Structure 1
């Protein structure tokens, strides 16, 4: 009898066949397109897509004008609109089934930094996320898996404690300036 949670869940489920050539082709294209780290990054978004599609099928098995069905459908459409994958005019529970892993990976903060263009490459954007140069709503985001909301999309910029922004220069710049001033006198 101790006071703790013991609540956890695997966010990814491995496929049944380990060496499918077309599956490795599609996952390798996804990683090479959107700048990912491993196959687990594909599989966890695939399993969240599996959660959303299972909820969608469970709603479509329900009858029309059911209150639980209407509430859960409106809540899931609100969640899809606020994550910004599904459009605000397209929102209907029949259009959830026609949604794709590419459109889920488009809302990555790494991909959104690459689309806004403050970083050169996708992996260079991931380097900037790792090295803590950018912030979202006066909050430094260190992890590239941040699902950027549509309302919080426009607030992506460089952080204040950043040499690329308005801050102090880095260790290499300080060391080169100190070496130059020591060589000059």
Structure 2
């Protein structure tokens, strides 16, 4: 006996036919569009998506008016609206299965840091997020993947203690000012 959870899963699935080629093309195109790091990052989304698509299938096999579908479905949609993937009005379950990877990348932090000016190219965006430069709401988000709720989006910007967003300038500029003061001047 101990404490200790052990509860943990993977986040993705690796594709069976492992050099489909067309698959590779589309997957890299995705890595290019949304500045992803790796083949996994696409795959882990592709695994989230599926799960949603599975559930939505399972709910459609049930009868309508049956409390299970009405309840879950609503929630599952309310969840998907909150992340800014599915649209209010488009909330009615069958419309989920018609959905894709691209939409679930669109509401990354990095993608919304690039989109919401701030950055200057999707790569730049991704670096900043990591470097402890941007904050959502109030916390400094460090993690590119941070899926940003539709609620949250308008509150994304730089951190209050970090060069770009009005802060003490970083150690590189700080050194060169010391060089100009003592060395040159």
User: What residue ranges of structure 1 are gaps of 5+ in the alignment?
Assistant: none
Structure 1 residue 184 displacement after superposition: 3.6
Q: Which residue of structure 2 lines up, in the alignment, with residue 155 of structure 1?
A: 155
Structure 1 residue 182 displacement after superposition: 1.3
Structure 1 residue 131 displacement after superposition: 1.0
Alignment deviations for residues 49-75 of structure 1 (CA, whole Å, 9 cap, x no partner): 110001001001111110011101000
Q: Which residue of structure 2 lines up, in the alignment, with residue 96 of structure 1?
A: 96
Distance 2:139 2:125 in 1: 17
Alignment deviations for residues 65-123 of structure 1 (CA, whole Å, 9 cap, x no partner): 10011101000010010011000111101100000111111001100011111110101
- For residue 154 of structure 1, give the secondary structure of its aligned residue in structure 2: helix
- For residue 154 of structure 2, give the secondary structure of its aligned residue in structure 1: coil
Q: Which residue of structure 2 lines up, in the alignment, with residue 20 of structure 1?
A: 20
Alignment deviations for residues 123-163 of structure 1 (CA, whole Å, 9 cap, x no partner): 10011011111101111000000000001000001101101
Distance 2:15 2:183 in 1: 60
Give the 5 Å matches for 1:30-41. 30-41=30-41
Distance 1:115 1:169 in 2: 25
Provide the alpha-carbon RMSD of the alignment.
Answer: 0.8
Between Structure 1 and Structure 2, the one with more helix by share is 2
Q: Which moved more, 1:44-53 or 1:175-184?
A: 175-184
- For residue 148 of structure 2, give the secondary structure of its aligned residue in structure 1: coil
Distance 2:5 2:174 in 1: 46
- For residue 150 of structure 2, give the secondary structure of its aligned residue in structure 1: coil
Q: Which runs of 4+ in 1 moved over 6 A?
A: none
Q: Say yes or no: does 1:75 pair with 2:81.
A: no
Aligned length, in residue pairs: 185
User: What residue ranges of structure 2 are gaps of 5+ in the alignment?
Assistant: none
